[PDB]
Amino acid sequence: ANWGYGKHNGPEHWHKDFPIAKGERQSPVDIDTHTAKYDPSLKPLSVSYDQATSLRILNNGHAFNVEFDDSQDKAVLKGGPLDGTYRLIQFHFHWGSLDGQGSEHTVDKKKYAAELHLVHWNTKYGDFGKAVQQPDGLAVLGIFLKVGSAKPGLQKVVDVLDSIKTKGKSADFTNFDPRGLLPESLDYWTYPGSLTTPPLLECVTWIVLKEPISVSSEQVLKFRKLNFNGEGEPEELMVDNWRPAQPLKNRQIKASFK
Numbered sequence: 472a473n474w475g476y477g478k479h480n481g482p483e484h485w486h487k488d489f490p491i492a493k494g495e496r497q498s499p500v501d502i503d504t505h506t507a508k509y510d511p512s513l514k515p516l517s518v519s520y521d522q523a524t525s526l527r528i529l530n531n532g533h534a535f536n537v538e539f540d541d542s543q544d545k546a547v548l549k550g551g552p553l554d555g556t557y558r559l560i561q562f563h564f565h566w567g568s569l570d571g572q573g574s575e576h577t578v579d580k581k582k583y584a585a586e587l588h589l590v591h592w593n594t595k596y597g598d599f600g601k602a603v604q605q606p607d608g609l610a611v612l613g614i615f616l617k618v619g620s621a622k623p624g625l626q627k628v629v630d631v632l633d634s635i636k637t638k639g640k641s642a643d644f645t646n647f648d649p650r651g652l653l654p655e656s657l658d659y660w661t662y663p664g665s666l667t668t669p670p671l672l673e674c675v676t677w678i679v680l681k682e683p684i685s686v687s688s689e690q691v692l693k694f695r696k697l698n699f700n701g702e703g704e705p706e707e708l709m710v711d712n713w714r715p716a717q718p719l720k721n722r723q724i725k726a727s728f729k
């Protein structure tokens with residue numbers, strides 16, 4: 472059992488190889504909006520993506536990653552609850568088989584159709600493999616998707632998916648501007664958590680935006696035509712690649728907004 476989402480290797484099995492799955496600071500979590508406390512000490516986030524250099528899109532068998540050049544400080548996330556500078560390395564999504572499910576975080580138990588994660592690492596640790604071993608090593612910006620109007624800045628991602636249908640396929644993906652994926656408002660909730668796939672390391676400051684972005688039915692239908700399987704293997708549609716909410720334990724979710 473290499474892990475996945477399937478009928479026999481999904482999230483409820485992961486603890487057998489990755490015992491941290493039952494740890495004290497796992498992600499994702501349900502955000503109870505009545506219990507999250509406004510923290511007037513939190514700053515506006517700084518999303519600095521003007522110089523972002525996208526390179527490649529890859530179907531890794533679990534999702535697809537849009538990869539960036541993080542060999543210098545092009546695209547960075549700073550401020551909000553963060554100290555120091557976090558470099559963008561990739562974004563990816565989680566989504567469902569239908570619009571009623573797909574997000575990993577939930578909001579008062581509401582599940583959104585999908586969730587985008589912009590993954591960043593703390594440059595004080597020099598590289599990503601080092602950063603994931605530190606409690607403050609990563610900052611993941613989480614943005615919910617709901618189905619409604621098309622998102623114009625998502626269409627270049629949708630259009631390339633037919634070329635990376637199966638696991639291990641990749642394609643060029645230069646000059647993509649991730650600012651086209653942000654909502655209007657940067658209001659957010661934040662809490663300390665983890666990677667949501669194995670190895671599930673507890674190295675993430677989560678920053679989850681309150682305002683979802685809207686994508687069209689047609690756009691999310693194309694996500695659901697991807698495959699978990701490799702070329703020539705029996706087809707396993709890449710859908711429901713999300714981990715369910717985990718116990719909040721001894722953690723406080725803070726709101727940036729009153």
Ligand SMILES: NS(=O)(=O)c1nc2c(F)c(F)c(F)c(F)c2s1
Binds near residue numbers: 669670671672
């Ligand atoms: N699903 S997630 O929390 O956004 C997320 N997980 C992981 C992960 F487990 C890794 F090993 C890794 F190198 C990543 F870049 C991410 S990014």
Ligand SMILES: [Zn+2]
Binds near residue numbers: 563
């Ligand atoms: Zn993710």
